[PDB]
Design a protein around this ligand. Sequence first.
Ligand SMILES: OC[C@@H]1O[C@@H](O[C@H]2[C@H](O[C@@H]3CO[C@@H](O)[C@H](O)[C@H]3O)OC[C@@H](O[C@@H]3OC[C@@H](O)[C@H](O)[C@H]3O)[C@@H]2O)[C@H](O)[C@H]1O
Length: 530
Amino acid sequence: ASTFTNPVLWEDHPALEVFRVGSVFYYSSSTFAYSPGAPVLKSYDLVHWTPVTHSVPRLNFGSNYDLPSGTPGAYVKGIWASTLRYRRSNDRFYWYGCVEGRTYLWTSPGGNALANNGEVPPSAWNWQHTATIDNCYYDAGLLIDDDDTMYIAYGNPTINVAQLSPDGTRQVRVQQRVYAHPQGQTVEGARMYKIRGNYYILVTRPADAEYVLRSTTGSPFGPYEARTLVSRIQGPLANAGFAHQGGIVDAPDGTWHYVAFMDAYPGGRIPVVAPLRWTADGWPEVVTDSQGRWGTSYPIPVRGAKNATEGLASTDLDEFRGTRFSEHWEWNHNPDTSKFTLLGGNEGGLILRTATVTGDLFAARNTLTRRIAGPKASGIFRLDVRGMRDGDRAGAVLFRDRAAYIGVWKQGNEARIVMVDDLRLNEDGWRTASTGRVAANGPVIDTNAQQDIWLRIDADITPAFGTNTERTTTFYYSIDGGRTYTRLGPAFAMTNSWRYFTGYRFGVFNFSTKSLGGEVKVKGFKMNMI
Ligand SMILES: OC[C@@H]1O[C@@H](O[C@H]2[C@H](O[C@@H]3CO[C@@H](O)[C@H](O)[C@H]3O)OC[C@@H](O[C@@H]3OC[C@@H](O)[C@H](O)[C@H]3O)[C@@H]2O)[C@H](O)[C@H]1O
């Protein structure tokens, strides 16, 4: 396939950093209070991406990341725009991110990637907390320079550059205000580069432009001068704001590409790719289509690229086998590890024991989530719910700050299917605004039905950002082994607001309104494109 179409991945992976090691491209994204945090995706062509690891296996940023006492928890805090690079000299990946005023470094060995055309064996990833720096590198962009000195560009509304110690664990020096926009416009989203002898920093003007800065002195400390890379460019997707932020990366053939993202709410922020050309005077420019738009299709960045993949694809059936989750799953806040187990053996399965007593889904620990692929997808959870106890509520949630679910309520000796809507957080502070209402009752389910209940969410995430239209999701259940599905409840209208940042997700939850002791088994999950 000699060309590709935008977007390259229709899944919420915001604040991307991209770089190349040998034959492999790596992409790092932001995850807020979702745990594990800071996913890493891998590609051979900048187009087909597979998740391979997460840089922060459990969030270590403070006790609120364990959701100890309900809303506002650490909702919409945690990992904002951060940065990742691979250091050849010690075969180590470095992830830095500022969270609530301190900067955290997590590192992993690379399994000798520099020597194996950039491949990291799946077993070699092993991320550990390596340092904390007592300066906030808001919207950090790491550069490992050609002489092995490490720098971080950061800031909002103006850009600073810090020099780190040789081991990357301490700040040695900061130059403040290496760039300020001359008309007082806010910039942020720094990514930092050393390209053919010169220093570049990419910054965004939220949320519609990207500037390229270049050091006027040839020093990493600048000062820097700017040119526009994109400003309010049209395409390649409608109703998804503007392509901005992101970063630039070289393919093995020496050609450069700009990987930006779109505000494709209600789905989230998704990556788009364009080629770059370099001017004779040493600046990069986006290659547009014949109409000056970010093109819907372009030549493939790598020809005859490897197609091999690690682990389960986004749409692959996941029966929760083995000892670890696939790279697609993330908990809402850190999980209580004493309250879930992956069963292993022939069948696998995930046991979710109730971990929180609450009437409020947003206060519940151990809600397991994953990204919805767009523009439309069905997510199906298969459960055994015989272990539910009085007051337990479990099910499949369309999860965000305006949420709905289809699930099972156990009251006394009755288990029944319900559809619940009007679950809402207040965008001003993220306290609960509504704990929901039963919008429809489904049937009472007997023990045989309880042993195999299938819960289905059909979500439409077709972009609607900036429009007056809200997309809708519908909910279904099966109590005949997935052979027949029955619709339950109204169509649920989804928010287009950007304030929660993360897109809508599919999730499975289990909590109690009375007491702990109950459990469900999640036998499987499947996402189908619809
Ligand atoms: O378009 C959705 C996302 O917005 C960008 O993120 C920043 C955001 O930008 C506003 C988006 O809507 C515009 O109409 C408006 O004019 C933009 O300002 O809001 C600002 C910012 O968060 C702030 O960052 C600095 C920090 O110190 C503040 O506490 C924090 O509120 C946010 O990053 C993003 O580009 C796009 O995806």
